[PDB]
Protein backbone atom coordinates (compact mmCIF):
# COMPACT_ATOMS: atom_id res chain seq x y z
CA UNK A 1 0.00 0.00 0.00
CA UNK A 2 2.89 2.19 0.58
CA UNK A 3 4.42 4.18 -1.99
CA UNK A 4 7.80 5.78 -2.47
CA UNK A 5 9.34 8.43 -4.78
CA UNK A 6 13.01 8.59 -5.81
CA UNK A 7 14.96 11.40 -4.75
CA UNK A 8 17.49 10.25 -6.83
CA UNK A 9 18.93 7.83 -9.60
CA UNK A 10 20.72 4.78 -8.01
CA UNK A 11 22.67 2.32 -10.19
CA UNK A 12 21.96 -1.26 -8.37
CA UNK A 13 25.51 -2.87 -7.74
CA UNK A 14 24.28 -6.73 -6.84
CA UNK A 15 21.37 -8.60 -8.60
CA UNK A 16 19.40 -8.13 -5.42
CA UNK A 17 19.33 -4.46 -5.82
CA UNK A 18 16.78 -2.21 -8.20
CA UNK A 19 17.90 0.42 -10.72
CA UNK A 20 16.14 3.58 -10.22
CA UNK A 21 15.63 6.95 -11.54
CA UNK A 22 14.83 10.37 -9.81
CA UNK A 23 11.27 10.98 -9.34
CA UNK A 24 10.06 7.26 -10.25
CA UNK A 25 7.19 5.88 -8.11
CA UNK A 26 7.76 2.29 -6.14
CA UNK A 27 6.21 0.20 -3.92
CA UNK A 28 7.66 0.44 -0.69
CA UNK A 29 7.76 -3.61 0.82
CA UNK A 30 8.10 -5.33 3.82
CA UNK A 31 6.14 -3.20 6.34
CA UNK A 32 8.53 0.07 5.34
CA UNK A 33 10.97 -2.22 7.54
CA UNK A 34 14.81 -1.51 6.97
CA UNK A 35 17.84 -3.76 6.38
CA UNK A 36 21.44 -4.27 6.45
CA UNK A 37 23.35 -6.70 4.31
CA UNK A 38 25.75 -9.13 5.96
CA UNK A 39 27.87 -11.93 5.83
CA UNK A 40 27.98 -14.83 8.15
CA UNK A 41 30.33 -17.10 8.79
CA UNK A 42 29.67 -19.43 6.60
CA UNK A 43 30.32 -16.57 3.92
CA UNK A 44 26.83 -16.76 2.82
CA UNK A 45 25.38 -13.15 2.29
CA UNK A 46 21.79 -11.40 2.58
CA UNK A 47 19.83 -9.12 4.16
CA UNK A 48 18.67 -9.06 7.84
CA UNK A 49 16.28 -6.19 9.52
CA UNK A 50 18.66 -3.34 10.85
CA UNK A 51 16.69 -3.34 14.52
CA UNK A 52 18.27 -7.22 14.90
CA UNK A 53 21.70 -6.65 14.74
CA UNK A 54 23.92 -3.90 16.56
CA UNK A 55 27.77 -2.54 16.21
CA UNK A 56 29.63 -5.04 18.56
CA UNK A 57 32.29 -3.20 21.17
CA UNK A 58 35.38 -5.66 20.72
CA UNK B 1 35.55 -4.41 8.25
CA UNK B 2 32.43 -3.67 10.55
CA UNK B 3 31.42 -6.27 12.71
CA UNK B 4 27.71 -6.58 14.21
CA UNK B 5 25.75 -9.01 16.42
CA UNK B 6 22.88 -10.57 16.24
CA UNK B 7 20.10 -9.09 19.28
CA UNK B 8 17.20 -11.61 17.81
CA UNK B 9 17.17 -14.70 16.38
CA UNK B 10 15.62 -14.21 12.49
CA UNK B 11 13.98 -16.39 10.24
CA UNK B 12 14.49 -15.81 6.81
CA UNK B 13 11.35 -14.45 4.41
CA UNK B 14 13.00 -14.57 1.26
CA UNK B 15 16.25 -16.04 -0.55
CA UNK B 16 17.70 -12.76 -0.23
CA UNK B 17 17.36 -12.52 3.57
CA UNK B 18 19.58 -14.48 6.02
CA UNK B 19 18.76 -16.67 9.27
CA UNK B 20 20.50 -15.43 11.81
CA UNK B 21 20.71 -16.64 15.34
CA UNK B 22 21.30 -14.28 18.60
CA UNK B 23 24.77 -13.65 19.88
CA UNK B 24 25.70 -14.55 16.22
CA UNK B 25 28.66 -12.54 14.82
CA UNK B 26 28.25 -11.12 11.14
CA UNK B 27 30.29 -8.97 8.60
CA UNK B 28 28.05 -5.34 7.74
CA UNK B 29 28.58 -4.77 4.33
CA UNK B 30 27.94 -2.06 1.84
CA UNK B 31 29.55 0.86 4.30
CA UNK B 32 26.75 -0.10 6.96
CA UNK B 33 24.21 1.35 4.42
CA UNK B 34 20.82 1.02 5.14
CA UNK B 35 18.59 -0.12 2.21
CA UNK B 36 14.72 -0.88 1.21
CA UNK B 37 12.90 -3.18 -0.52
CA UNK B 38 11.02 -1.67 -3.63
CA UNK B 39 8.83 -3.26 -6.27
CA UNK B 40 8.89 -1.26 -9.23
CA UNK B 41 6.17 -0.13 -12.01
CA UNK B 42 7.24 -3.14 -13.81
CA UNK B 43 6.73 -5.67 -10.62
CA UNK B 44 10.70 -6.07 -10.48
CA UNK B 45 11.87 -6.18 -6.98
CA UNK B 46 14.93 -5.36 -5.32
CA UNK B 47 16.81 -3.11 -2.24
CA UNK B 48 17.86 0.24 -2.89
CA UNK B 49 18.78 2.38 -0.35
CA UNK B 50 16.37 4.08 2.19
CA UNK B 51 18.47 7.85 1.76
CA UNK B 52 17.39 7.54 -1.83
CA UNK B 53 13.86 7.02 -1.57
CA UNK B 54 10.76 8.73 0.77
CA UNK B 55 7.19 8.51 1.40
CA UNK B 56 4.96 10.01 -1.47
CA UNK B 57 1.95 12.66 -0.13
CA UNK B 58 -0.36 11.38 -2.53
NA1 LIG C 1 20.69 -1.99 14.45
NA1 LIG D 1 14.19 7.54 2.97
Redesign the interface.
Same mark, same amino acid.
Given at each position: E????? $??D @?V?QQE? =??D?KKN =? /??????D????? /?? /???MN???????? @?? =? /? $?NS
Open positions: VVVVA $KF @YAQ =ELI =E /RLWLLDSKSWW /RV /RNSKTGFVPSN @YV =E /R $K
